Design a protein around this ligand. Structure first.
Ligand code: HEM
Length: 151
């Protein structure tokens, strides 16, 4: 359970992300796919991409990065009271897309890394710890839905 102080640190840096949702989404997906190539393989839309330059040149990838970060932002702004937002996401990711929780840990690492690169003055250790907590909460609550579904 995040404190109010922790949520403030999370949403302070998130408001910086929302000035360039698309650029952040590209940086995060590419870091994910480079660092953990099994994740790329889960996307029929993207598994043709073989180099970082190809990934950076894909408009479809950029579009999906906006979808991802828009969903995550809506969850973060609920400060934990995110049950309604997680239901559809956990159902699609468990049952349709077949995304292990571990891959959710991998994208959380990518988010944290890109936030540090883009927003160091608003992403010192206190804010890094708070964002880690927020993304852990996200994962914990998705994992419980996965367990219900048998995934
Ligand atoms: C912050 C974590 C994530 C968020 C907020 C997120 C959000 C979304 C949203 C909003 C969609 C479209 C609606 C839906 O199908 O539910 C989607 C689709 C999808 N996601 Fe995620 N996602 C996350 C992480 C991941 C990860 C780590 C993987 C893969 C390793 C992944 C794989 C997929 C796939 C394969 C689709 C369908 C893409 C398509 O073919 O159009 N997601 N995601």
């Amino acid at each position: 359970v995040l404190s109010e102080g922790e949520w403030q640190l999370v949403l302070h840096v998130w408001a910086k992300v929302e000035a360039d949702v698309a650029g952040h989404g590209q940086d995060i997906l590419i870091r994910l796919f480079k660092s953990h190539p099994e994740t790329l393989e889960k996307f029929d839309r993207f598994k043709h991409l073989k180099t970082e330059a190809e990934m950076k040149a894909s408009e479809d990838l950029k579009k999906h990065g906006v979808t991802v970060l828009t969903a995550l932002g809506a969850i973060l702004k609920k400060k934990g009271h995110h049950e309604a937002e997680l239901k559809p996401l956990a159902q699609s990711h468990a049952t349709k897309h077949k995304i292990p929780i571990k891959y959710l840990e991998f994208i959380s690492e990518a988010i944290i890394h890109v936030l540090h690169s883009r927003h160091p003055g608003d992403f010192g250790a206190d804010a890094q710890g708070a964002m880690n907590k927020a993304l852990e909460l996200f994962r914990k609550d998705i994992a419980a839905k996965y367990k219900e579904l048998g995934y």
